[PDB]
Each structure stands twice: as C-alpha cells, then as structure tokens.
Design a protein around this ligand. Sequence first.
Ligand SMILES: CN(C)S(=O)(=O)c1cccnc1
Length: 435
Amino acid sequence: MLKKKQLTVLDLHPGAGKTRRVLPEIVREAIKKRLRTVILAPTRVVAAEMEEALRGLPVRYMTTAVNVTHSGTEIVDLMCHATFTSRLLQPIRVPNYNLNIMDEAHFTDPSSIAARGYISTRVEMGEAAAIFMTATPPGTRDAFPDSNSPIMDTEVEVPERAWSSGFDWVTDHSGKTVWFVPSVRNGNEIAACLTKAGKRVIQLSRKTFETEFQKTKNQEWDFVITTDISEMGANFKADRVIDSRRCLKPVILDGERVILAGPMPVTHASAAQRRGRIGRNPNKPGDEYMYGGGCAETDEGHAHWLEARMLLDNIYLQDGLIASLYRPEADKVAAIEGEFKLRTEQRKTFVELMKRGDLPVWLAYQVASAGITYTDRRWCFDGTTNNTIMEDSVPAEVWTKYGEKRVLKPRWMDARVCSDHAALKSFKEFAAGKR
Ligand SMILES: CN(C)S(=O)(=O)c1cccnc1
C-alpha cells in the first residue's frame, strides 16, 4: 500500500479493526520507511480515539482534542478532514506528504470530498501513495455487510413524530438504543416523547458532537437520538439500532438558492454505517437493527459535491492545474473543473466567510464572487420578501452594526443557516457584525 503511485481502499467490514489494529501497523511501517505521513480523522472524537490506538508512536497531533505536546522529531501528522482542506485553502504551506491515510473515507461533507479529490489527483500524478479506510467505499450497494456477531434485521414502521399508541416495541426495551433520525428538529420531538415516557435521552448533532458524546461514556442512558454524524466512527455500547432510513438533502434550485429537501432515503453506505453501530461484540449476539424504509442513491445532485468543486477550484496544486474529484464520486455533480476559481482577493474573502463567518460553502461563494468584502453585511438585509427568514412563525429581527433594527432577509438564501435554533442564532450574530 505504502509504495508510491498507489491508492489503496481498505474496505474491511464494520468492526474489523481498521482504526485500532490496522492503522498502528501502517504507521509503524511508514515511520520505518521515512515516509512523511498525514492521518485524517473525520471528527475530534475519532482523533482522541486514534491517540489511544497510536499511543507511544511519534505522532504530531494538529488538533486541540489531544493534549499532547510534540517533541519535534515527528514525521507523521494527525488532523481532521476539514483541517487538512482548510490549510490547503489558507496561505499556510502544507507539506507534500508521501503517504495520505484517510479514516472513514466515506464522509460526504464538502471538505472530506475535496480532500479525497486533492489526494487522489496527487496519486494519479505519481506524486504520492494513499489509503482510504471505509467499510462503505463510494459505490457500495450492500446495506447489510458482515459483522462481529449475528444481527437481527427487521423491516418495521419507525415513528418520525411523538406518539401516544402503536409503537410498543420502542419503549418495551430494557437495553440501550441508538436511533438515527432525519434532522435535529425531528430528533427533538422524538426525544421529548421518550423523556415524557421516563427515558434518559442524549441528543447528538454536528454542532454538539464533541460535548454530548462524552455523556454516552460518563452517564447512564436509555436512548441516543442522533443525526447522520454518528456514521463516522462514533462507537456505543448499545444492543439496538433503530434507523428511520431518512435524511435531509441540501439542493441548489436554479443556482439561486439552497433548500433542505426531504426527509428522503439514505444511501446504501449510510444504511450500512448506521447498522454497523451494533453487532460488534462477538460475545453478545442478537443485537437488533430495526429499519423503516429503503435505500436510494440520493448523493447524486446533492449540494456537497458542488461545494467540494468550489473548494478544489480555489486550492493550488501545480501552476494553472486544478484537482479532480476522486473517480468513483466524480459524476455526483455536473461541473467544469475551474468554473468556481476566484481571483486572489475574492478567494481570500471566500475562505474567511467559511473559517471565521462559519457560512456554508455555497453561501460563502455567492457573497465572495459578488465582490463583497468579509465585514460588509448589507446583503443579509437587501434580499426579496420571499427570502425573509422566519423564527417562531414570524420574521426574525436583528440589530445591525449601525444600531438599526432590521428583518433578516438575505440576498442569497441557504436553508442551512436557519435549519434549527442554533444555526439561526449563529446567523443572526453574523448579520449583526458580531463575528
Ligand atoms: C473499523 N474501524 C473500527 S472504523 O472506525 O474505521 C469503522 C467502523 C465501522 C465502519 N467503518 C469503519
């Protein structure tokens, strides 16, 4: 795998030991061969798990989730998928790693797709070797892969709202359950219904992941209500996975706006990843997997593949060349390589709106490509009436940096900035000039 010009896909089934057994072996061999190596973790929780697995080995942890200071003699760096893409975008010089290892290489966030495209272009160019570690590589059609112990699979109607009757099997369980819901808002309703019936619930989402996940290990619980984020390495000591098999799809309508379509079916990779959370202990067979719909290839036409092209177009590779997306996923979007390449000063705005402004990729590109400087927020208020952001079924209001009260009405509308109370609270601070 380590020899140059080779992209290796390590597709061992969920729970085989790719992060606690296979990864330290590759690292020892890379250190022995003097290969400058990068290890890419999907999340900060998985970076702290990789540290336990690699403890003792000379690894430089370029993450605040690991409290280890480095000796300076390290040739292996460990960082998140987003961190890698972020430094490629920023004027910081990234070493030309001889070996690139991506764990959970199935992650569909725009920064993970872009990192796969950048790394695979380098392998294609004959400049590096790479290992993509995932039970579900891009293109997998098996939602029921092999496991460490037998799993009871059951097609069942799974509730997506609070209930007063008809779903006894959900509450008549004396064990631990990981329930994959389509959205934070859908999960809040089910969590409230389970709490009312006397259950201890923990809710996990992208924004709360490195705070609430610790609660699964520290306190007793009955259910974990989670979105698709727990598909990327999150391990639990549970005996049941309830899977709605639904998810929200960010879609770009007429190149003018972004909506959150669905709930709609998850891909086979996501259904396999969600089921893979159980059936992991060979001494405890009979972990149940209750699924509530079918699978469809909803990754085609999804905004993350377009956003990844927006990132890759603004990353230097070699002269005027631009990195292509990783081949098994290059057709999920219809895009010309280079069409989103911004000029030097606008690219600087694009990066800041994402890193400091915390705006979704698509939205950041809309603003930066219009010649708007980072701190200019007039666009948050000069959109049409249909772009009015509503909070509590009434127009949201912010105090502008000028001391004036205004209705939130953005020139470009992206549903991700107001898909829950936390996203809208964060966007209101942005529109007010607070960051
Ligand atoms: C094998 N590893 C434990 S892992 O965390 O890389 C993983 C887990 C489940 C599915 N795919 C990969």
